[PDB]
Design a binder for this molecule. Structure first.
Ligand SMILES: CCCCCCCCCCO[C@@H]1O[C@H](CO)[C@@H](O[C@H]2O[C@H](CO)[C@@H](O)[C@H](O)[C@H]2O)[C@H](O)[C@H]1O
Ligand SMILES: CCCCCCCCCCO[C@@H]1O[C@H](CO)[C@@H](O[C@H]2O[C@H](CO)[C@@H](O)[C@H](O)[C@H]2O)[C@H](O)[C@H]1O
Ligand SMILES: CCCCCCCCCCO[C@@H]1O[C@H](CO)[C@@H](O[C@H]2O[C@H](CO)[C@@H](O)[C@H](O)[C@H]2O)[C@H](O)[C@H]1O
Ligand SMILES: CCCCCCCCCCO[C@@H]1O[C@H](CO)[C@@H](O[C@H]2O[C@H](CO)[C@@H](O)[C@H](O)[C@H]2O)[C@H](O)[C@H]1O
Lengths: 25, 25, 25, 25, 25, 25, 25, 25
């Protein structure tokens, strides 16, 4: 359960980071 | 570069949590 | 779109924290 | 107090994101 | 249980950060 | 510098986790 | 101690934003 | 505009955290 929660959080941060990276592209 | 590094770290964290989730199963 | 995802992320976080808070109450 | 602070912080963030989502309409 | 897995994860992350600090220098 | 700051946050988390872990010990 | 750590995180955020603000100036 | 607003908000947050840190001691 906690692993799942951590994965969801990391996935959100990764998508956020990706949109920032694309904005700077 | 900052956003890219954060995206990479977050994707590694997500993979690591997924692996833990699959192991805990 | 960014704002909407951030709000969803935060709601999920609040729900997790609330659960923790309730366990400690 | 830790969990309660975390809950308050998450709820604050959710409120701010929601206000932002509404403004961006 | 939860705290021990969280301490272990946090230590791994700190080591990864430290490695990156040394590589970047 | 970012890696250094990441490291401090990670160390902070690990010590908070250890304090909880010791109370559960 | 938690408030002191939160202050440090907020200061880091402020410096990061200031960096961006200056480059955008 | 965005970076300036983020800087302002982070500074507000830091002052709040500092005030709390001083109240607690
Ligand atoms: C917050 C979570 C961050 C965890 C980062 O873990 C590291 O991620 C790096 C990728 O940036 C990897 O390359 C490295 O091997 C790994 O240890
Ligand atoms: C607020 C963040 C919380 C903790 C974040 C921890 C992030 C650390 C991930 C960085 O990982 C590094 O990235 C690169 C990939 O090769 C390398 O350079 C380095 O050698 C590796 O270690
Ligand atoms: C709970 C709010 C925290 C928000 C995000 C975490 C902020 C982490 C910033 C670093 O804070 C410092 O971390 C040091 C070790 O790295 C500690 O040294 C001891 C120190 O005492 C603490 O001040
Ligand atoms: C990878 C992300 C990590 C998540 C957060 C981890 C942060 C770890 C501690 C950072 O250290 C802080 O760095 C700030 C910025 O370098 C400094 O503020 C500096 O800049 C502020 C912003 O104006 C001023 O208010 C301060 O006086 C000035 O010291 C502050 O003193 C220092 O303690």
């Amino acid at each position: 359960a906690x692993a799942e929660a951590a994965e969801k959080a990391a996935k959100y941060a990764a998508e956020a980071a990706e949109k920032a990276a694309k904005a700077x592209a």
